[PDB]
């Protein structure tokens, strides 16, 4: 107790926390590793994701050497705030949280050699830009970039503790994604030049693939069945003018109901996605089926249909006969081309 | 070497009075400012605001902080900013702004041998932009950021863009979802009052909205419904069930488009360009259904006491008038 208390009071003597270790002598090297406890939800509307990490940093400060029975110390939050620590920040971080329930989720340990190990539990809400042109068959590499805010490459350099791939670890139950599947992460480091100097950046990209099953049942299948339904009217007799007129408009209204609901699932981008083109093409087929009947009805001479017992009766429309093959085939051609293109991407 | 630096830093801050500006009894302190826009996001028409994250750098010379014998630029800890004088700059249109504090507060203090102080800040600001949306979605917006000193006039402090028109960087790297940054402009001016002139820096962007989203989601579905209402003109007059059902369903479909676009589009409670087009298409499908009632009444009401002529006249006027409506609409707004 007395020996332990003696070291703590003596360590801070003659210590200036305003100066990085090795200032004017060498480059402060910080070893970093990340344990991802939970890769949180990804918001496509805000193009951001949440990640919960244990951020570990290790550097050497020769000013904090000590000799005693113990080999590793342990500093409280008050004493840790009196010691220089790296000014690490997240370049793409939007609004991050440092947890302090019930006490500050931080820990600073000092070895007799002078090595400081700094761990903190963080929730980082980073921004993940997305190219939504292939939605809902898109895949994104969400980045997590961090580094020193004030100290340039000639002052503070960051390195991964272990091999870079092994320096970022994701918990096996960490994935908290609903619409994505985390395929893996690539760990790398780079350099950025700004108006203040050149800085070392540590990057980690999390590769996410969107699940397509939800949009097939909710959007693709109802749209395909609506288009089939519009082409079904081609097999009705041409004398059923009210029946085929109700068929055409109500399928257009059905497509409008499906088109509005499908659009709410995606943020307001200003380009046509893969699902946007599918809805538009399905909208055209349903629209053209009603236009086809208007042409068929225009050449219907007699207003009475054929009776079972049998006068002259209308023959089956040649436009109807051709549309019973052309319309189903063109939609089948579009589906094969559409699904072959985007699924291969 | 590090011990010599420590002696210098303590010497600089010994006797330093934060409450007094550099050259307190002399010329105004000139503060040079640069902005590195990390991103612009959440350009909201409902809230009339936009959010941007930037690296806000301020440069000024303080002879009280000049040091000699060290050929290095002293980058001190971020907490040393509380022991130095920094300008009292604020943003006029800022509604809610913060400095990021993970892992530490995102600020920097870098000292230079001649006494120049670099004060950096990573700030996310939600600034206010009053948007004229009468041409929405074919509208160009103008978002500004006004920087001013709270309690200093041009006698005490001065503002300028460090680097000229290259002071603000990162604008070309910004990709907005529904907007395109046509240009950004830097303005340096002194707001002259009776009490005195107050320095101000203005950073303004010109955002042009992209119409690709609205063409495929708002305009095209309304056009197709309007054309579908013209099918009734090629159906025989005696087909009351076919023509009325087609006409009244297109009225219902237009209402469904309008009511759902009301929720999907931002809640802007006044007349816009999109509202005029949707109401224009609603009238056209209203007249088409009303056209048959005139045709039906002529044959059956005034019959016992030319319906084909009315339909033939309708087959030409309706496509022509709608095309005329489109030509006047697009020329006035585009």
């Amino acid at each position, epitope marked *: 107790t007395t020996v332990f208390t003696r070291i703590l009071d003596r360590l801070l003597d003659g210590y200036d926390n305003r100066l990085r270790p090795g200032l004017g002598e060498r480059v402060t090297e910080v070893k970093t590793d990340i344990f991802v406890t939970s890769f949180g939800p990804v918001s496509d509307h805000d193009m951001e994701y949440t990640i919960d990490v244990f951020f570990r940093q290790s550097w050497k400060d020769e000013r904090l050497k000590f000799k005693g029975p113990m080999t590793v110390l342990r500093l409280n939050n008050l004493m840790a705030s009196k010691i220089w620590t790296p000014d690490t920040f997240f370049h*793409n971080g939007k609004k991050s949280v440092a947890h302090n329930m019930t006490m500050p989720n931080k820990l600073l340990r000092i070895t007799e050699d002078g090595t400081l190990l700094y761990t903190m539990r963080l929730t980082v809400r980073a921004e993940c830009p997305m190219h939504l042109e292939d939605f809902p068959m898109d895949a994104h590499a969400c980045p997590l970039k961090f580094g020193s805010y004030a100290y340039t490459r000639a002052e503070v350099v960051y390195e991964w503790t272990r091999e870079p791939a092994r320096s970022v670890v994701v918990a096996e139950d960490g994935s908290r994604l609903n619409q994505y599947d985390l395929l893996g992460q690539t760990v790398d480091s*780079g*350099i*950025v*030049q700004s108006s203040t100097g050149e800085y070392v*950046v540590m990057t980690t*990209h999390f*590769h996410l693939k969107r699940k397509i099953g939800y949009f097939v049942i909710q959007t693709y299948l109802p749209c395909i069945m609506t288009v089939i339904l519009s082409q079904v009217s081609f097999w009705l007799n041409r004398e059923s003018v009210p029946a085929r007129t109700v068929f055409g408009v109500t399928t257009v209204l059905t497509m409008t109901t499906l088109s509005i609901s499908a659009r709410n699932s995606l943020p307001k981008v200003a380009y046509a996605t893969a699902m946007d083109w599918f809805i538009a093409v399905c909208y055209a087929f349903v629209f053209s089926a009603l236009i086809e009947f208007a042409t068929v009805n225009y050449f219907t001479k007699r207003g009475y249909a054929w009776d079972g017992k049998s006068k002259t009766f209308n023959s089956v429309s040649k436009i109807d006969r051709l549309s019973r093959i052309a319309f189903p085939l063109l939609f089948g051609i579009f589906n094969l081309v559409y699904w072959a293109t985007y699924l291969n991407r | 070497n590090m011990s010599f630096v420590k002696e210098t830093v303590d010497k600089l801050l010994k006797g330093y009075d934060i409450r007094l500006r550099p050259d307190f009894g002399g010329p105004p302190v000139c503060v040079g400012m640069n902005i590195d826009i990390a991103s612009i996001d959440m350009v909201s028409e409902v809230n009339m605001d936009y959010t941007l994250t930037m690296y806000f750098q301020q440069y000024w010379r303080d002879k009280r902080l000049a040091y000699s014998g060290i050929p290095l630029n002293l980058t001190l800890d971020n907490r040393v900013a509380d022991q130095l004088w920094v300008p009292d700059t604020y943003f006029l249109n800022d509604k809610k702004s913060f400095v990021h504090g993970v892992t530490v507060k995102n600020r920097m203090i870098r000292l230079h041998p001649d006494g120049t102080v670099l004060y950096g800040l990573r700030i996310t600001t939600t600034a206010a932009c009053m948007m004229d949306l009468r041409r929405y979605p074919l509208d160009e917006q103008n978002c500004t950021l006004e920087i001013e000193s709270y309690g200093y006039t041009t006698d005490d402090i001065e503002f300028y863009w460090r680097g000229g028109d290259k002071a603000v960087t990162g604008v*070309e*790297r910004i990709e907005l979802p529904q907007f395109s940054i046509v240009e950004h402009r830097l303005v340096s001016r002194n707001v002259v009052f009776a009490t005195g002139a107050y320095p101000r820096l203005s950073l303004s962007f010109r955002l042009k909205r992209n119409i690709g989203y609205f063409i495929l989601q708002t305009y095209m579905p309304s056009i197709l419904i309007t054309i579908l209402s013209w099918v009734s003109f090629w159906i025989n007059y005696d087909a009351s069930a076919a023509r009325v059902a087609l006409g009244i369903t297109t009225v219902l479909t237009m209402t469904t488009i309008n009511t759902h676009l009301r929720e999907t589009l931002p809640k802007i409670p006044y007349v816009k360009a999109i509202d005029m087009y949707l109401m224009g298409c609603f009238v056209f499908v209203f007249l088409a259904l009303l056209e048959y009632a005139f045709v039906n009444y002529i044959f059956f009401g005034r019959g016992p006491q030319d319906v084909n002529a009315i339909d033939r006249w309708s087959r030409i006027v309706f496509p022509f008038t709608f095309s005329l409506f489109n030509l006047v609409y697009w020329l006035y707004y585009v």
Partner: nanobody, 123 residues
Framework: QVQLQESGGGLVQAGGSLRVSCAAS????????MAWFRQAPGKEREFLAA???????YYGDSVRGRFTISRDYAKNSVDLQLDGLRPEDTAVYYC?????????????????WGQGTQVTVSS
């Protein structure tokens, strides 16, 4: 059609410097990762440098400190400043652009490619 055209480069006396440029058209790559790849004759295709939307400059270990990559986001182009040229740099230099899925150093992660440019360091 999206076209990437590498411009500049060729034969150079040892110790010279070449700035290889790459103009892009048909799609703005401000949100894409533009990179430079090298393919020696018969060996492999090698990653050299990459610069993303955040101006982060990634370099391969074999060309780190010698080659400098820069991007002109206004002009939608990427440049590779070759310094300290050696005869081992004689290859075809490719300009790539992609989202960097599973990549940023893998050639398969880039969808847009240039025709290449033969840079010969003869001594």
């Amino acid at each position: 059609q999206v076209q990437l055209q590498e411009s500049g480069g060729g034969l150079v006396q040892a110790g010279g410097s070449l700035r290889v440029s790459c103009a892009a058209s048909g799609r703005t790559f401000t949100a894409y990762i533009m990179a430079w790849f090298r393919q020696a004759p018969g060996k492999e295709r090698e990653f050299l440098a990459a610069m993303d939307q955040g101006r982060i400059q990634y370099y391969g270990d074999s060309v780190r400190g010698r080659f400098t990559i820069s991007r002109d986001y206004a002009k939608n182009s990427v440049d590779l400043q070759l310094d300290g040229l050696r005869p081992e740099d004689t290859a075809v230099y490719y300009c790539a652009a992609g989202a960097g899925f599973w990549g940023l150093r893998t050639a398969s992660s880039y969808h847009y490619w240039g025709q290449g440019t033969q840079v010969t360091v003869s001594s």
